[PDB]
Amino acid sequence: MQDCGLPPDVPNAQPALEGRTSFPEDTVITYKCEESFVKIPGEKDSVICLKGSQWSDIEEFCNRSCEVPTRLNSASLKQPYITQNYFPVGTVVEYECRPGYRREPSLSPKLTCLQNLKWSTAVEFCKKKSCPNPGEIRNGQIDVPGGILFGATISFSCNTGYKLFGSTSSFCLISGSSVQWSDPLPECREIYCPAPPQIDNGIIQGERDHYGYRQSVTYACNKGFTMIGEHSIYCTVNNDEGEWSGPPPECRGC
C-alpha cells in the first residue's frame, strides 16, 4: 500500500502533476509536448502508477513540428492536411485553389516544413481568375483602371451625343464554378433634339426626321421678309439632354 513518486522525466514533455508530488496506485499522469513539439500520432503520452510504487514505461513522443500552415486567400489545405496538426520537419502538404482562383501550372501547390520549423516560401501557385473580356460599347467607352482580374471594377461612359442606358459599372464577381462580370454592358444610344421650331413667314431648309449632336438646321425667309437672330441653329446636348443652340431667326414683315 505505497504511493508513487514523481513521474519519469520525458524530454520535451511536461507532466500535469496537479501540484502533487505523490500519487496513489492506478494514477494516470499525462504529458504535454513542450513548445515547438507535437505529439507523435500513435505514441503513449502518459504513465500509470502500478504496484510496487512503480511508473509504467514511456518513450519520447514529441517531434519538433511546424504550426498549421497560415491561411491563404488564393488556396486552401487539401485533405487531410486541412485537419492535421502534427507537422514534423520534411512534412509536405498540398493546396487546392479557392474561388475564384486558378492554378499556375509552372508553380507547385505544395508547402514544406523546414528544419527551422517553418513552411517553405509561398509562391502564387493559385493566381486570381480573370473575367471575360469586357468587349466594346457602341458609341461608348469602357474604363479598366486595374485590369479585369477577380475583384476588379470597370466603368462605362457614353460618348458626347449619347446617353447611357443600363449599368454604369461592373464588378468581376465570383459565381459558382467560374467568375463573371456583375452588371452587363450598357448601351450608348444616340440623343435626339426635339423637332426644330418652325418660324412665321419662313421655312426649314431640308428638314430631317431627327437631329443629333452637332447637327444644324438652316432657315429661309419667304420672298419679301428679313431675319432677326441667327440664320441657323445647331443641336446641343452636353449632359445629357438634346437642346437647340438658341432660338430660331425671324422673318418680317408685311
Write out the residues near Pt ion by the rule CB under 5 A.
Answer: 227, 231, 249
78 or 231: CB nearest its own copies: 231
What part of residues 98-137 is at the interface with Cl ion (CB under 5 A)? 133
Three-class SS state of 83: helix
Sign of CA dihedral 180, 182, 184, 190: negative
Distance, CA of 76 to CA of 99 (rounded, Å): 10
Under 8 Å between Cβ of 191 and 215: no
What does DSSP assign to residue 149? B
Distance, CA of 56 to CA of 43 (rounded, Å): 14
Candidates 126, 132, 139, 127; CA nearest to 182 is 132
In angstroms, give the least distance from the CB of 45 to its own copies. Answer: 51
94 or 104: CB nearest its own copies: 104
Under 8 Å between Cβ of 74 and 124: yes
38 or 199: CB nearest Pt ion: 199
Nearest-CB residue for Cl ion: 227
2 or 218: CB nearest Pt ion: 218
What does DSSP assign to residue 11? T
In angstroms, give the least distance from the CB of 231 to Pt ion. Answer: 3
**Interface stretch with Cl ion, choices 89-97, 177-185, 196-204, 221-229 (CB under 5 A):** 221-229
- Using CB under 8 A as the binding rule, whether residue 232 contacts its own copies is answered as yes
In angstroms, give the least distance from the CB of 144 to Pt ion. Answer: 6
Contacts of 140 (CB under 8 A, 6+ apart): 156, 157, 158, 159, 162, 164, 186, 187, 188
88 or 134: CB nearest Cl ion: 134
Under 8 Å between Cβ of 8 and 58: yes
Write the interaction track for its own copies spanning residues 179-218; mark x where CB under 8 A is met and - where it is not: --------------------------xx-------xxx-x
Q: Which residue has the cell 485553389?
A: 97
- Using CB under 8 A as the binding rule, whether residue 220 contacts its own copies is answered as yes
Contacts of 197 (CB under 8 A, 6+ apart): 244, 247, 248
Q: Which residue has the cell 464588378?
A: 171
Residue among 142, 158, 179, 191 that touches its own copies (CB under 8 A): 142
- Using CB under 8 A as the binding rule, whether residue 229 contacts its own copies is answered as yes
- Using CB under 8 A as the binding rule, whether residue 82 contacts its own copies is answered as no
Q: Which residues bind Cl ion (CB under 5 A)?
A: 133, 144-145, 227, 231, 249
Q: Which residues bind its own copies (CB under 8 A)?
A: 134, 136, 139, 141-147, 159-160, 205-206, 214-216, 218, 220-221, 223, 226-232, 234, 249
